[PDB]
Design a protein around this ligand. Structure first.
Ligand code: HEC
Ligand code: HEC
Ligand SMILES: [Zn+2]
Ligand SMILES: [Zn+2]
Lengths: 136, 137
């Protein structure tokens, strides 16, 4: 009952992006430029359906360099993953939560079953624990 | 065959990279905001270091942003910029056709000069076939 590394996530649908700058409540550890990616099953839930088992959402976080008032993507810091499985991850609302340092499969960041990730996402119970909304 | 096609479905293509251009940057007018670059399959072959087939398309998707408590949040789409590869049809501008679509709407074509203005800046990147964006992980 470990969350699987989402191989190939960079080929998935780009949901949205956001920049979190120093001073933001989530700066540690989510400071930087992040991109949200969704597999096919996750798109189904984002469009108004139920999230099927097998849905995966990825929070892809980069550092940025500020250069003459442009923010430029630097190195990947981590990915956060949410993997849908109603049965296996019922303790955390049907989603398994994991982080991978530098986006590497052997650098697992979560040490508490995903409880700390879940505690913040629980605020989005009404939208099946997902913050991100589909835009055009 | 003289016009760049609107790239229907580009939001489902591969996300190459992003960048933010803030006030004070030389390109804030007209490329200020958060932009994302997308590539179709044919464009990927070219970005990977292979050659660009005719039919390759690269999309520059530009959003305004809002400042919200040390976050930059995506606002309204300002425009999309499109490069469509056709070595024969678009030979006057280096084998790419250039178009801009206001607010990303198919009916709001922006380019009036056959893409010469667009090409004039892209011409500096001759050695990478007029493409600035690089693949990252
Ligand atoms: C609040 C204090 C949070 C904690 C702790 C965690 N996350 Fe979260 N997450 C948060 C917000 C406000 C957002 C939206 C970001 C945006 O661009 O709008 C997210 C997003 C995710 C995503 C993308 C899917 C979604 O819900 O929007 C993933 C995959 C994600 N978060 C995973 C994740 C993991 C693995 C966490 C513990 C290591 C975790 N999050 C904690 C807010 C908060
Ligand atoms: C310099 C003054 C430019 C003019 C005028 C135009 N473009 Fe360009 N473009 C420029 C840069 C520096 C970049 C890279 C942005 C990044 O994130 O690295 C781009 C990129 C594009 C792309 C993406 C493909 C690529 O070459 O990286 C497209 C599709 C694109 N630009 C199209 C485009 C059009 C249609 C233009 C005239 C309306 C145009 N550009 C002008 C720099 C400059
Ligand atoms: Zn402050
Ligand atoms: Zn600045």
């Amino acid at each position: 009952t470990k969350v699987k590394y989402p191989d190939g996530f960079r080929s998935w649908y780009h949901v949205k992006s956001m920049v979190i700058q120093p001073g933001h409540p989530l700066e540690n550890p989510f400071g930087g430029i992040h991109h949200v990616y969704a597999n096919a099953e996750a798109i189904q839930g984002l469009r108004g359906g139920n999230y099927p088992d097998g849905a995966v959402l990825v929070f892809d976080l980069f550092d940025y360099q500020e250069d003459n008032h442009a923010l430029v993507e630097g190195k990947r810091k981590l990915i956060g993953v949410m993997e849908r499985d109603a049965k296996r991850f019922s303790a955390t609302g049907g989603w398994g939560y994991e982080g991978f340092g530098e986006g590497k499969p052997d650098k697992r960041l979560v040490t508490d079953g995903g409880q700390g990730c879940f505690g913040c996402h629980a605020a989005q119970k009404e939208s099946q624990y997902v913050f991100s909304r589909l835009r055009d």
